[PDB]
Amino acid sequence: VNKERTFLAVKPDGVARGLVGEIIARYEKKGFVLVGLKQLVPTKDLAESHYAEHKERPFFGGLVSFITSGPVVAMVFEGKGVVASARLMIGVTNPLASAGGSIRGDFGVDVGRNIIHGSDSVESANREIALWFKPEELLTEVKPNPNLYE
Amino acid sequence: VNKERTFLAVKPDGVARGLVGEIIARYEKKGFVLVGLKQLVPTKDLAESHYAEHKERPFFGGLVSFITSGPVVAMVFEGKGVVASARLMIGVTNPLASAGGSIRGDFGVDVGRNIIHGSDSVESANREIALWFKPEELLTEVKPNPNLYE
Amino acid sequence: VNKERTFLAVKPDGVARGLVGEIIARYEKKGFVLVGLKQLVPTKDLAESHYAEHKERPFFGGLVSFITSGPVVAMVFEGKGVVASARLMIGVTNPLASAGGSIRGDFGVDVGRNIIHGSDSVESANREIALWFKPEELLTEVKPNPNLYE
Amino acid sequence: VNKERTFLAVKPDGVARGLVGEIIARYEKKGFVLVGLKQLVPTKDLAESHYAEHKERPFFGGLVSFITSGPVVAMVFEGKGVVASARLMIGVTNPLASAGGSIRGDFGVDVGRNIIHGSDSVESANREIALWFKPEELLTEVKPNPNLYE
Amino acid sequence: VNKERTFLAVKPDGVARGLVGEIIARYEKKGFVLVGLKQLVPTKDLAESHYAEHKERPFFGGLVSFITSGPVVAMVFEGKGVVASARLMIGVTNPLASAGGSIRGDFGVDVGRNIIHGSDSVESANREIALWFKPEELLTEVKPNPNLYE
Amino acid sequence: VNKERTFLAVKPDGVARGLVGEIIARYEKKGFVLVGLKQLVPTKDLAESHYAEHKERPFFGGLVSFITSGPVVAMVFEGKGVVASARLMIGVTNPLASAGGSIRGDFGVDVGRNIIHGSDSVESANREIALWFKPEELLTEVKPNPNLYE
């Protein structure tokens, strides 16, 4: 279905390195539709909730601290297979192992400063979207370029 | 002063044509700092207030209708001379007269679909920013690349 | 051999989305030489002949209708291993599975609107070229940048 | 009117330097619609006719020889004010005097190798189009991105 | 004459902001030939000599300190009218007044951090080149793309 | 460790095709720091030493001749995993087999004209760096964008 949505957040390092527009442009070119978008400095509570899955791990603390360390550009994209597609456009966890052509492959060097976050599944996408955005902040009627879908 | 701010809004045509990231990237490259950012479908009241200066003109109606016709990406940039600089990066009113190298020169053809709005003065910038953004939505502490300012 | 040729056609969706120049530029950068090029709205006969291999399949009808639905930019590129190379630059059938860095990976989302066609073999390349182009429309003397071939 | 057309020809030097896609992409981004397109090696007769206005000047010979010296990509673009707009995107006669942001400003250095030709007026555009293209080679129904024109 | 040369130095701020390749690529695209190139951290003596013309001004001290504050990428480009052309590609002294399409127009905001230096005349170019480069470090035989000069 | 270094040399074909800035920009974007950089026409001795590992093979002669055939831009980049990362950004030996997104995948077609050389291991990187650069030519203090490393 073409109404699939994913949550992406350009982390503080990406924002600080001026990659926000470059990242958004890549998704717009692909044909995904921007359904939600806003810059914010995440509070500890939102952060801990975002990374709840790692709450029992030791690096959980470092994740929370970093993401709340500066502005973040949170966005929600809609489109067919956007969740897996966006992961693919992002690259693998280690930027050094990510292929040129992907966001982390092109701009990153360190796991801890890997620029962007993308939901890893439709269900995590749904949880993250509802976590980071009020429903009023999301487009209800999405109209993509007609030359994109059969 | 380097804390000058301007208000930019990628109008519905720019959003629909997938130029949001391309426009943001241009300002980030320049060295201006993203201080506010969000996508929204403007209500009639916000629109009429935004274009209040033309409220006595006949084309006022067309301005209001268009901007409320679809999503808009509103943003606030900070930096030295950002208000005049951003206007310069945008181009002149008529995209056909705008030089290559500017947003309207590169992507537009019609006055009525000229892609983006930029405050025309510091005072209009201050009015528009306060109009489109709650104070909570704007970064308070802005830190630019240290290689930008002497 | 460096005189190998392949047939590429930017389908109606690619033309309509303004990707013609972006696609041609990618091949020119690679070092392949443009040997034939023209825009046309394919007739049903040319279309059915182009997709003859699927004439017994049900989706054959949809293929024919789409390609004749609007202008198409047909082109022939020459160079060593251009047939496989061009396929690689294009991506896989499903744009969602195509890697960033490839045409379909960067710009497409749907199999049915996958932007471009590239011959799948030297023999199909030879058949397609002879199908879409009169011999008078193809360069006879091709001279590539001397820094490309040993 | 939005049905205005102009004739552009990427001269032999532009084709040889691999700038065809880069030039087409610039016009597509602007929002102009590709209405005719083909590569050809101009004959002396077409060349002399193209440059007829200089037939009494001494450099006329050099113009004719160069343009017939290799392949040329001829194209016709449609859009509002496309004739003046395209000239503006091209730059001035001397590439060294052309501003960055324009084709000649970005890629050329010599008047004699100034990359591209653009009609200088609507009437010359009409003469050149009819000179370089058969009517069958031009789109009759042009549909631009709806977000381009008011 | 096509053997004209100019001296360009990407100052410490440009190097630090990762603009070295972007700046070199702009000149290579234009058709100018790289004749000398090296990264170095300028000593005080070279700096004072470089800016000797301002030695009687008060800002002379600030010029010397900045340029010796970090690595610099010095380069010499050759081509017809390269000295004026390169200045034009650079922009005006104040990056805020420089037009999009130029280096300072696209990437700078402050006079003191204006990214790059370009000789202002053929004679200053000759003095700077001889100042920053040993003759052994400059190409003697320069061969440009044959499609550049008539 | 983040102080790892690799040696890259844009071979004569890459320099001649104007890809120097494009290649440097890719590494700068990735976050690697330029530690050494200079253009030179390699002597036979440096060449034979560079390719010593193939000195017993027949193609050794062709390697030496080509690299000494014109200017070369030698550079040293520093960063975590830069040696493997840079190889990955370069592509595989055969440009035709290299994926879009990599230097050879995007710009090359022939093994013999594969544009750039990158050390294949840390030890070969150390040997090549010491071979091509005097210690005085390498930055001692390297400071990367702070948003790159955790």
Residues 72 through 91 of chain A touching chain F, CB cutoff 8 Å: none
Q: Phi, psi at residue B127, to the nearest 5°?
A: -70, -45
- Convert F95-145 into a string of H (helix), E (strand) and C (coil): HHHCCECEHHHHHCCECCECCEEECCCHHHHHHHHHHHCCHHHCCCCCCCC
Calculate helix-pair angle for D20-30, D82-90, nearest 10 degrees: 130
Q: Which of F5, F23, F42, F117 is catalytic?
A: F117
Beta carbons of C17 and A145 less than 8 Å apart: yes
Find the DSSP H helices in A5-96: 12-16, 20-30, 44-50, 60-67, 82-90
Contact C131, C9 (CB under 8 A): no
**Cα-Cα end-to-end distance for chain C:** 12
Beta bridge partners of A8: A75, A118
Pairwise CB contact (< 8 Å): D106 & E30:
yes
**Whether the Cβ atoms of residue B103 and residue B89 lie closer than 8 Å to each other:** yes
Q: Which of B26, B102, B148 sits opposite E109 (nearest CB)?
A: B148
Cβ proximity of B15 and B115 under 8 Å: no
Q: F5, F82 in Cβ contact below 8 A?
A: yes
Helices and strands (DSSP H and E) totals, chain B: 7, 4
**φ, ψ dihedrals at A53, nearest 5°:** -55, -20
Among A20, A39, A139, whose Cβ lies nearest the Cβ of B71?
A: A139
Provide the pairing of β-strand B116-118 with C33-40: unpaired
Q: What is the resolution of this structure in A?
A: 2.2
**β-strand E72-78 against C33-40: which pairing, if any?**
unpaired
Asked whether the beta carbons of residue A84 and residue C96 sit closer than 8 angstroms, the reply is yes
* Residue A139, CA distances (Å) to A82, B23, B28, B72, C13 in order: 16, 21, 26, 11, 25
Distances (CA, A) of F133 to B136, D79, E139, F65: 53, 55, 18, 21
- Quote the tokens at residue F112: 């013999």
- B71 and E CB contact within 8 Å: no
Cα D99 from Cα D105, distance rounded (Å): 5
Nearest to B18 by CA among C69, A148, C130: A148
Residue E81's alpha-carbon distances to A90, C107, D43, E15, in angstroms, are 44, 40, 33, 26
Dump strand ranges (E) for B60-136. Answer: 72-78, 116-118
What are the chain A neighbours of B29 within 8 Å (beta carbons)? Answer: 18
Contact in structure between A4 and A82 (CB atoms under 8 Å):
yes
User: Could A150 and C111 be called an inter-chain contact, meaning their C-beta atoms sit closer than 8 Å?
Assistant: yes
Searching chain C, which residue's CA lies closest to the CA of residue D29? C18
Q: What are the residue ranges of helices labelled H in C20-121?
A: 20-30, 44-50, 60-67, 82-90, 103-107
**Encoded tokens for F110:** 């022939």
Pairing of strands C116-118, D116-118: unpaired
Rounded Cα distance between F99 and C106, Å, is 13
Chain B residues within an 8 Å CB radius of A138: none
Q: Count of domains in chain B?
A: 1
Chain centroid to Cα E114, Å, comes to 11
Rounded Cα distance between E13 and E108, Å, is: 10
| Long-range interactions of C119-123: CB distance < 8 A, separation 24+ | C119/C6, C119/C7, C119/C8, C119/C83, C119/C86, C120/C83, C120/C87, C121/C83, C122/C4, C122/C83
Asked if A35 contacts A139 with a C-beta cutoff of 8 angstroms, the reply is yes
Tell if the CB–CB gap between F109 and C147 is shorter than 8 Å.
Answer: no
Q: For residue D48, what are its two tokens?
A: 């002399």
> Which residues in chain F have Cβ-Cβ distances shorter than 8 Å to E39?
34, 36-38, 137, 139
Closest residue, chain A, to F30 (C-alpha): A107
Distance between CA B43 and CA D75 in Å, rounded? 43
State the virtual CA torsion across B135, B136, B139, B140 in degrees, nearest 10: 70
The amino acid that residue F42 corresponds to is: P
Which residues are within 8 A (CB) of F2 and not within 5 positions of it... i.e. 6 or more apart? F78, F79, F80, F144, F149
- Closest to E35 in 3D by CA, of F40, A127, C11, F127: F40
- A-C C-beta contacts closer than 8 Å: 63
Return the structure tokens found at F76. Answer: 């040293």
Name the residue with tokens 């030097």: D13
CA E123, E145, D24, D139 torsion: positive or negative?
positive
Pick from D145, C104, B17: nearest CA to A33 = B17
- CATH number for the domain that contains residue E79: 3.30.70.141
Q: What is the DSSP letter of F80?
A: T
C25 touches chain F (CB under 8 A): no
**What method was applied to determine this entry?**
X-ray
What does the alpha-carbon distance between residue F12 and residue C147 come to, in Å, rounded to a whole number?
8
Domain extent, residue B60, equals 1-150
Residues near B109 by beta carbon (within 8 Å), at least 6 away in sequence: B95, B96, D30, D31, D32, D79, D80, D81, D85, D148, D149
Compute the distance between CA of residue F145 and CA of residue A108 in angstroms, rounded to an integer: 11
How far from B3 is each of B35, B74, E94, E118, CA to CA, in Å? 10, 19, 18, 30
